[PDB]
Amino acid sequence: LLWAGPMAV
Amino acid sequence: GSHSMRYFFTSVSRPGRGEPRFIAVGYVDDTQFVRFDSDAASQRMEPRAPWIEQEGPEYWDGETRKVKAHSQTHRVDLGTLRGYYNQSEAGSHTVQRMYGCDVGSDWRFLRGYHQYAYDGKDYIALKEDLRSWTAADMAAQTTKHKWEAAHVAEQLRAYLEGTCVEWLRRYLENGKETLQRTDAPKTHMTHHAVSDHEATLRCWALSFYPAEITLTWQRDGEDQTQDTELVETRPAGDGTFQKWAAVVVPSGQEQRYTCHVQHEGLPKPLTLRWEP
Amino acid sequence: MIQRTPKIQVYSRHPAENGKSNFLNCYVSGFHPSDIEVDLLKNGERIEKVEHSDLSFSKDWSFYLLYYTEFTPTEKDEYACRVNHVTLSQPKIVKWDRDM
Ligand code: NA
């Protein structure tokens, strides 16, 4: 299962 | 023994040619189980192993939802990074992300990680403690600060220490028939004369899983890199791996040379010898 | 901008026997950036029916790919992999040696 919280640089 | 789950993401910009390429793949140990390619037909996250196929529409709809979010994030990042470094529009640039978790032999949490790279080189990494960042350069300090301000490490850490290991266990139990196996390497040795004075010995490891193997040549018991040709471990394409190691020896001295093999699947390290 | 030249291996899945169906693999590893062109050749003409794994990478961020096609080895026939990357000043052709 993937992570739901990637945030932009 | 130890297990892991890892996701890798590549985003490549296409100057003058519209939207960037985006690719994502999931692995448990050395086995691929999911993928999303931006150029593929489905525009969905797709199964690649047989033991992930049995997850319902709720899983596929959610992984598709989330990988499209990852995609949008990297779409944004390529342009931001282009500005951070003031690079012209003419060149393709690459972003890569890797994250995942290791569990030990009791399947409990061993370590978690998250690295991010630009143009083939570290940009930002979560440190071992899962609580702070390491920034390669001045532009990446900007990122470090945005990600600090918004407390991203706390929410990533929770993922790696919780969600990541719960689902890895699930996958290990579901795919037990293929994921919790060690296949011992099949070894053999080949012999090829060069001249009347020298000969090549090659030591083969075939059909092994996982990919972690050690193949070293010894001479009269002593380490022996000098004269040793050593290929990188390679995939067979059936889910097992292959490798070889070679040495050039004086003719009639072949019995001085041993090939030692170390693998998860082997009770004792091996030792082979060209016997005539 | 880091650039890395592909390492290339041509080999079969199973030990090669004449007239008996097999897979011919071309494994391309350790390269950067990711644009790479890879062909499998039979007597120097390209094989259409080739497949490739999904792009991935190692700890050092360099990429890797397996290309592979179903085939029957014969006495006569010569198999090779042709690779093109921006690091190579011209296409590198690597021949299939049965013992390699
Ligand atoms: Na943070």
Side-chain angles (χ1 to χ4, degrees), chain B residues 234-238 242, chain C residues 10-17 20-26 40 47 49-51 66-73 79 96 100:
Chain B
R234 68 198 190 191
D238 56 6
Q242 309 185 330
Chain C
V10 201
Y11 55 98
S12 43
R13 194 179 280 184
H14 299 317
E17 306 229 20
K20 173 253 189 53
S21 208
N22 204 339
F23 287 79
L24 181 64
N25 294 329
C26 182
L40 287 168
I47 299 157
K49 208 179 203 321
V50 186
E51 279 191 309
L66 179 66
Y67 287 70
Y68 64 102
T69 192
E70 195 153 55
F71 86 129
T72 299
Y79 291 94
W96 181 47
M100 224 129 80

Side-chain angles (χ1 to χ4, degrees), chain B residues 126 131-133 144 146-154:
Chain B
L126 194 69
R131 204 175 294 243
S132 53
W133 303 95
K144 184 174 163 148
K146 283 155 140 151
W147 293 4
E148 275 172 352
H151 302 272
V152 178
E154 289 97 317

Side-chain angles (χ1 to χ4, degrees), chain B residues 247-261:
Chain B
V247 68
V248 126
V249 311
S251 303
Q253 280 188 224
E254 287 89 339
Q255 286 85 248
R256 297 208 223 176
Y257 289 93
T258 56
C259 179
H260 298 258
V261 191

